[PDB]
Structure 1
Amino acid sequence: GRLIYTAGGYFRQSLSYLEAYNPSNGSWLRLADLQVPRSGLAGCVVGGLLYAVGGRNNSPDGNTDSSALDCYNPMTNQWSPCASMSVPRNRIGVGVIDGHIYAVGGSHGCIHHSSVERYEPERDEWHLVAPMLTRRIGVGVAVLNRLLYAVGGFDGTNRLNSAECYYPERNEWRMITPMNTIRSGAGVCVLHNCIYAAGGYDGQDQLNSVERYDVETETWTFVAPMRHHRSALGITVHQGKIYVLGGYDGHTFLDSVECYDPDSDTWSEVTRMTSGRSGVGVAVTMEPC
């Protein structure tokens, strides 16, 4: 069986929680805390290992943007540090291609990054690649057909509807069709041949809307909206279903977890996180042992 892992997040301050949800039975496990609290991080999995990337420790005793990469092994229930990134990246996006981790955008204080770097687990090494055409924090990232997409975000001045694609063999970014909605701090993932962008902040409101980009038609189509408006949500795919976790609706740090069934085009309440939080990192791997 495989679990949905949520790492870190924010409520009152940045959080160190690592908790795993089992869609088969509805259960939550609390697992080993992150060594350093962090919100605005991303999660990913490579070789059955869970990685937590970037973020920020918003704490009463100060605010520290994170360049950290840390690895969680479900077999041992232990976190280990990996090589740090070139730069702190709060409100980061990440994607995995061919066993490598791409770290995209994010902020360091008032620095809004367009830079991108790639981590190679085999060598515990980061290397910068071509920067994006746009500065993007709160950027959504997904991978389809070994191409990397950076979607929406905030450039330091404006929230963005724009999106762009990275072609690894050309080390080159190109713009794609923009979304039909401005979205910053959305959830972005892949399902089938489509990039989905769920929720976000448009500069005025948290969004419940959801749209998807078909790489073959180069067009975005709205699907059914989520049951909750949310920015700074976590998102993942577990057995062909999209799950969204937490976020902020303009009133409450949400504990709501919803899942999308593409065949019926419906969103369902699935479970509640143990506590409301925004800006988590989320990914899916094996059960501890």
Structure 2
Amino acid sequence: GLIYAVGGYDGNTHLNSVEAYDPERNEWSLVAPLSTRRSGVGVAVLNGLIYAVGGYDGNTHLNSVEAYDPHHNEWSLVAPLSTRRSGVGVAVLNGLIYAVGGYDGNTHLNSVEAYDPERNEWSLVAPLSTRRSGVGVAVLNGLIYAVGGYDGNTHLNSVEAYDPHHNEWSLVAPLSTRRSGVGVAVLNGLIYAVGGYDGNTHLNSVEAYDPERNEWSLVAPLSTRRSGVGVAVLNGLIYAVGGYDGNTHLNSVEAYDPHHNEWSLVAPLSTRRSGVGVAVL
């Protein structure tokens, strides 16, 4: 019932702090911080815990992973990834956490690994068609979609879907615009791609993917350009959290109502946060 904003980058320092948003009171409040600073961190919720996957602490890219238990307000480190990953996309499917692409410092990654919490183990599965960091990742109709990103030498409009029963990725319809640092979430059977960076401007635009028609369509843009934005879905709204408009890092937060195709600004974070991980628990 809360939106957690995990780590990020305030323009100055990389952040270990974590804050939670209560929509009934329109307030953020700080809770226990991560064991390490993490920007470009992937976040997902599994079995009542928030996992913070990889990221960048300012002076090394991270393979470490930690889980937050809200009943005890504590983070605990678990098994690390096979490779350091910042700008990594994270989603939960059939009881596993998938870590998709990212950047290890030395190269941008097409590799993908899955975490089983019952064995505390990551294992590598089929890689993406292309290397992708700053990639948005969401689960819809039993597939993991990898949306946009950056392959090292071009920003990407392409999109690919992973079928776990065949261990295969396949390319589908591309976005209208190239998008890295893009936030992605699923609402009423559509995938929304929120903001990002096309290589030469930060984006306020938003588009929605309909899997039945394999088509993206542009909807109402954000109030502000936002790359490195965290996106989550709560009570029928899409929240866009923080990000970077090109010339300042953002503490602002806005919510999208699909029935009215309108974004509205709500209470801002305690800290500016880009490269922030967002999940709902």
Give the TM-score category using the shorter length.
Answer: over 0.9
Please report the TM-score for the alignment, with normalisation by the length of structure 1. 0.96
- 1:100-119 aligned at under 5 Å gives the runs 100-119=96-115
Q: What residue is the counterpart of 1:71 in the other structure?
A: 67
CA distance in 2, matches of 1:108, 1:42: 14
- 1:4-153 aligned at under 5 Å gives the runs 4-11=3-10, 12-58=12-58, 63-153=59-149
Find 1:161's aligned residue among 157, 160, 169: 157
- Aligned-partner residue type, residue 3 of structure 1: L
CA shift for structure 1 position 99: 1.6
Q: Structure 1: which 4+ aligned runs deviate by more than 3 Å?
A: none
CA shift for structure 1 position 90: 0.6
Q: What residue is the counterpart of 1:223 in the other structure?
A: 219
CA shift for structure 1 position 275: 1.6
- Compute the RMSD of aligned alpha carbons: 0.7
Q: What residue is the counterpart of 2:265 in the other structure?
A: 269
- Aligned-partner residue type, residue 205 of structure 1: T
C-alpha contact 2:227 2:244 (8 A) present in aligned 1:
yes
C-alpha contact 2:28 2:267 (8 A) present in aligned 1:
no
CA shift for structure 1 position 13: 1.9
Find 1:211's aligned residue among 207, 224, 229: 207
CA shift for structure 1 position 29: 1.8
- Aligned-partner residue type, residue 8 of structure 1: G
SS in structure 1 at match of 2:203: coil
272-281 vs 134-143, greater mean Cα deviation: 272-281
Aligned residues: 280
SS in structure 2 at match of 1:276: coil
- Aligned-partner residue type, residue 30 of structure 1: L
Please report the TM-score for the alignment, with normalisation by the length of structure 2. 0.98
- Identity rate of aligned residues, in percent? 53
Q: What residue is the counterpart of 1:200 in the other structure?
A: 196
CA shift for structure 1 position 110: 3.0
- Aligned-partner residue type, residue 158 of structure 1: T
Deviation track 1:151-192 (CA, whole Å, cap 9, x = no partner) reads 000001000000100010000000001111110001011111
SS in structure 2 at match of 1:118: strand
Deviation track 1:14-34 (CA, whole Å, cap 9, x = no partner) reads 100111010111122211110
CA distance in 1, matches of 2:142, 2:93: 6
- Aligned-partner residue type, residue 14 of structure 1: H
CA distance in 2, matches of 1:17, 1:80: 15
Extract unaligned runs of 5+ from structure 2.
none
Does 1:258 pair with 2:254? yes
